[PDB]
């Protein structure tokens, strides 16, 4: 049976987490994203000027082209990418997927062109939302799941320290106590779950649903919840230069918790201080608006507090406080 551990590393301020992945012999630094299902990489088919500052895949060297197949994706922050497709060998933490679909980028939006921290994305959402046409392809996880000791992956994202992606096994030394599991609704291809209630410092409210997303930097909630939270932060104000609510870096922030199938997941106020707003001398809050989409995005700010198991059996998500 196979299992493996891939180490992730946060970029400045934990904006994103990157992990090495070997494709046809070349290692690339990718952003593992539980919110999408495409494995796409910077390639030699992009303009030379866009290949600069990146490790790129050269499909002609080892890939098998899928003639006439294309991909096109648009993300929540407005970024997008598109290209063609090849199959190749993909290795993550010693687990190798043979004939894994690799989406070679032919076009990338400015957000990707400016980000030299990653060389593409490895999607870990359900394969049902893979964008390849005419026939969608499976994610790296779906491709190898039948070969793992257990059909699950687990993650520990940390604040300014290396973390891990465990494939096919659970490392009990990464959390305190026992895991609590909750059912996942994968109807929209996400690892979506329900929370029965929330507590924002001194205020508590009714439940809602959200997705566990390693590919989103913040914890994005409904505007009502954001308001409630910041009403308790002295001097918090919105700053469009920073991207949302900001406050004095020294401010004592209230904690945020959600009740999940009887387990209380708490994000300590210290983790809600994302870092320098980069707009003078305030800090950006880890909690921001979900722009009215109707569901919450449990991004990295939230994940930094837990060890989370993404189990394809159910499917379900297990949670426990990080050790």
């Amino acid at each position: 049976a196979a299992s493996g551990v891939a180490t992730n590393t946060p970029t400045a301020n934990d904006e994103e987490y990157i992990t090495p992945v070997t494709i046809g012999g070349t290692t690339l630094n990718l952003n593992f994203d539980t919110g999408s299902a495409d494995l796409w990489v910077f390639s030699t088919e992009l303009p030379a000027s866009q290949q600069s500052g990146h490790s790129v895949y050269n499909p002609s060297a080892t890939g098998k082209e899928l003639s006439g197949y294309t991909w096109s994706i648009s993300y929540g922050d407005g970024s997008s990418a598109s290209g063609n497709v090849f199959t190749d060998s993909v290795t993550v933490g010693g687990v190798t997927a043979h004939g894994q679909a690799v989406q070679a980028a032919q076009q990338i939006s400015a957000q990707f062109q400016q980000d030299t921290n990653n060389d593409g994305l490895l999607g870990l959402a359900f394969s049902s939302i893979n964008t390849v046409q005419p026939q969608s392809q499976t994610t790296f996880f779906d491709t190898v799941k039948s070969s793992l000791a257990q059909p699950l992956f687990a993650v520990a994202l940390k604040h300014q320290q290396p973390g891990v992606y465990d494939f096919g096994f659970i490392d009990s030394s990464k959390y305190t106590g026992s895991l609590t599991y909750t059912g996942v609704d994968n109807s929209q291809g996400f690892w979506s779950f329900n929370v029965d209630s929330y507590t924002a410092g001194s205020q508590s409210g009714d439940g809602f649903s959200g997705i566990a997303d390693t590919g989103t930097t913040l914890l994005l909630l409904d505007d009502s919840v954001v308001s409630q939270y910041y009403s308790q932060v002295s001097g918090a104000q919105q700053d469009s230069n920073a991207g949302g609510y900001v406050f004095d870096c020294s401010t004592n922030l209230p904690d945020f918790s959600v009740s999940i199938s009887g387990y209380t997941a708490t994000v300590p106020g210290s983790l809600i201080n994302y870092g320098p707003s980069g707009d003078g001398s305030t800090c950006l809050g880890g909690i921001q608006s979900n722009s009215g989409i109707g569901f919450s995005i449990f991004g990295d700010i939230f994940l930094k507090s837990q060890y989370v198991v993404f189990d394809s059996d159910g499917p379900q998500l297990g949670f426990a406080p990080q050790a």
Partner: peptide, 4 residues
């Protein structure tokens, strides 16, 4: 930050 980003929002995948």
């Amino acid at each position: 930050x980003v929002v995948x």
